[PDB]
Nucleic acid binder design. Structure first.
Ligand SMILES: Cc1cn([C@@H]2OC[C@H](OP(=O)(O)OP(=O)(O)OP(=O)(O)O)[C@H]2O)c(=O)[nH]c1=O
Ligand SMILES: [Ca+2]
Ligand SMILES: [Ca+2]
Length: 427
DNA sequence: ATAATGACGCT
DNA sequence: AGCGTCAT
């Protein structure tokens, strides 16, 4: 009877990251309702991050800045920096690399996003156990940790609830048994208290964190108490936690697959997936799905913390929505070159920082109408990091899709240009 | 007219 | 390889 408590895994999530990045750069933005915005033209810009002060008014991501200034008129606005006509997030990627470095010290991480890392803390927690002489774990070692499920049984202050739940946990603790899963979860947690404290001391950035036995519980744990907090979710808390957890809130169940688990099976919460046999599930959703599903509703999952703190593709895209769609040869060529240019700037910096080289160029477009994010996608070779070579070669491998005899103009209008660098190798 | 960006499965 | 899914 295996129960998926082999590993200790954490998901670190920087809190309102871009907002934190701007606020470190611009002290006026601190302790204030503010938001990051890109492209001022259309309705003031689309809001891509929201400080917690501004959330309290109702302001959300993707929302237009002119609309959100209706909800919050005191909303300050850091514009994203524009470069060659495209929104340029270099500031954040640099900010992210600062944090991934600190995290790289404490253990072996997987860059999830600009904002997130998974951390496999298993070997690190074994190392620290013998380095405490099996002596207890002080509450003071966990000043921002929550214990999902606790406090239980037989208090109005939010932090007062936190101590009770941590005190119940530390009390129930089997610290003589140096292989107790619940004890590990607790040691990894103190480590995360530390790595989170190191991130803040050394960059100024606060973050939230989830600690558990796999990537999926960690991510879910990480959302339980934000910001500047961390949740520990132990095996035994899974049944109650999943008891009313909506299925779509689990990483990979947020799209169509998860939708139909609700549809086919007629449930609505994650715990309800227990009652089915694995063959039942494989039969509804496939061999690998019914398997992963059957273990997941039992809180067991085994996708590993792949050690890969760097991405595997480098991509530069630009959207031309509505009346801005490109419809001329001269337009398409100009953007292919603008994208090619930031691309070589990112590419060159990759060749010297991370010591490697992309070898294939992928070109993608998307036309007016087609609801697929990508209408076309074609692979051509990538030899020198030369912006002009890449533009021309991109145009080459997509020239055969301007279905208008008039070569001056371009139909259908293109609503997207994507240039992605892949197939890296040593350098 | 939610934009940029990225990992992976399927075939 | 080319498309579809999913997440951030
Ligand atoms: C959903 C979504 C997110 N992001 C960004 O990827 C990292 C971060 O993700 P996040 O949700 O964590 O944003 P955030 O303000 O840090 O929110 P909280 O950490 O306070 O929850 C957000 O900066 C996108 O680029 N596109 C997206 O479609
Ligand atoms: Ca975040
Ligand atoms: Ca994130």
């Amino acid at each position: 009877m295996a129960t998926g408590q082999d590993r200790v895994v954490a998901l670190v999530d920087m809190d309102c990251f871009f907002v934190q990045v701007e606020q470190r750069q611009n002290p006026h933005l601190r302790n204030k309702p503010c938001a990051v915005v890109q492209y001022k033209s259309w309705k003031g810009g689309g809001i891509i991050a929201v400080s917690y002060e501004a959330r309290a008014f109702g302001v959300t991501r993707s929302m237009w800045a002119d609309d959100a200034k209706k909800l919050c008129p005191d909303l300050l606005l850091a514009q994203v920096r524009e470069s060659r006509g495209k929104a340029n997030l270099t500031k954040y990627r640099e900010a992210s690399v600062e944090v991934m470095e600190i995290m790289s010290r404490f253990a072996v991480i997987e860059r999830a996003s600009i904002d997130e890392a998974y951390v496999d803390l298993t070997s690190a927690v074994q190392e620290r156990l013998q380095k405490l002489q099996g002596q207890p774990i002080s509450a003071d070692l966990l000043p921002s940790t929550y214990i999902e499920g606790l406090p239980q049984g037989p208090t109005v202050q939010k932090e007062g609830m936190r101590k009770q739940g941590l005190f119940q946990w530390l009390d129930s603790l089997q610290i003589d048994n140096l292989t107790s899963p619940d004890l590990q979860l607790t040691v990894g947690a103190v480590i995360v208290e530390e790595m989170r404290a190191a991130i803040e001391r050394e960059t100024g950035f606060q973050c939230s964190a989830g600690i558990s036995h796999n990537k999926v519980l960690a991510k879910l744990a990480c959302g339980l108490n934000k910001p500047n907090r961390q949740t520990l979710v132990s095996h035994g808390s899974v049944p109650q936690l999943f008891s009313q957890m909506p299925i779509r809130k689990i990483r990979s169940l947020g799209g169509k697959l998860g939708a139909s688990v609700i549809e086919i099976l007629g449930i609505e919460y994650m715990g309800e997936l227990t009652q089915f046999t694995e063959s039942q599930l494989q039969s509804h959703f496939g061999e690998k799905n019914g398997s992963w599903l059957y273990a997941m509703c039992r809180g067991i999952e085994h996708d590993p913390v792949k050690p890969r703190q760097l991405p595997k593709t480098i991509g530069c895209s630009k959207n031309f929505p509505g009346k801005t769609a490109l419809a001329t040869r001269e337009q398409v060529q100009w953007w292919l070159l603008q994208l090619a240019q930031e691309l070589e700037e990112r590419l060159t910096k990759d060749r010297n920082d991370n010591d490697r080289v992309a070898t294939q160029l992928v070109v993608s477009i998307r036309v007016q109408g087609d609801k697929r994010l990508s209408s076309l996608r074609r692979c051509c070779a990538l030899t020198r990091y030369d912006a002009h070579k890449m533009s021309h070669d991109a145009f080459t491998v997509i020239k055969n899709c301007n279905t208008s005899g008039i070569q001056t103009e371009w139909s259908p209008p293109l609503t997207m240009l994507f240039l992605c660098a892949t197939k890296f190798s040593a350098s």
